[PDB]
Symmetry: C3
Amino acid sequence: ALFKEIDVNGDGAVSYEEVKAFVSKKRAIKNEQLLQLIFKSIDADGNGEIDQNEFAKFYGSI
Amino acid sequence: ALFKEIDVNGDGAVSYEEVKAFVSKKRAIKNEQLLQLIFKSIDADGNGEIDQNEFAKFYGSI
Amino acid sequence: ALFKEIDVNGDGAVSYEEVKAFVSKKRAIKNEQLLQLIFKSIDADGNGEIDQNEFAKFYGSI
Ligand SMILES: [Ba+2]
Ligand SMILES: [Ba+2]
Ligand SMILES: [Ba+2]
Ligand SMILES: [Ba+2]
Ligand SMILES: [Ba+2]
Ligand SMILES: [Ba+2]
Ligand SMILES: [Ba+2]
Ligand SMILES: [Ba+2]
Ligand SMILES: [Ba+2]
């Protein structure tokens, strides 16, 4: 449950400092998750890296 | 006065480095201030922490 | 070329870690570049710093 994720110390309470620590790491993730998506959207062969011809395709008109 | 806040060293000038340091800490505050607001909006008893039943209320439909 | 900027190590590939490092430093720049613009927009004499009377002008109605 979401509460148990935030209430890190596990004492049934969520301190401000904890909410804050969560609120941020939540945001910190759809960043990593979006970028990853954007990435693999470019890396076609899922080989781990983008070469010139993938980067080439990705950009431009038509 | 706002100028005296930014011109930290107090020499009548505001360097870029200072504006920058201010511009950021200004932003750094409505973050803390908004979240705090959001927080105490959830913590009903203002006891310092949110328990399950407050978190319970906060979320959901109806 | 943009690719050579990102592919820092210069091995023809762009790792995620690199894209990420780029994506951020790109963003990190229009920040510095916008603020600088805003700054020199205030510093009229381009002397390096804003005095009271420039800051005075900058603010307000009429
Ligand atoms: Ba706790
Ligand atoms: Ba893929
Ligand atoms: Ba590839
Ligand atoms: Ba100064
Ligand atoms: Ba309250
Ligand atoms: Ba409470
Ligand atoms: Ba590389
Ligand atoms: Ba100027
Ligand atoms: Ba000046």
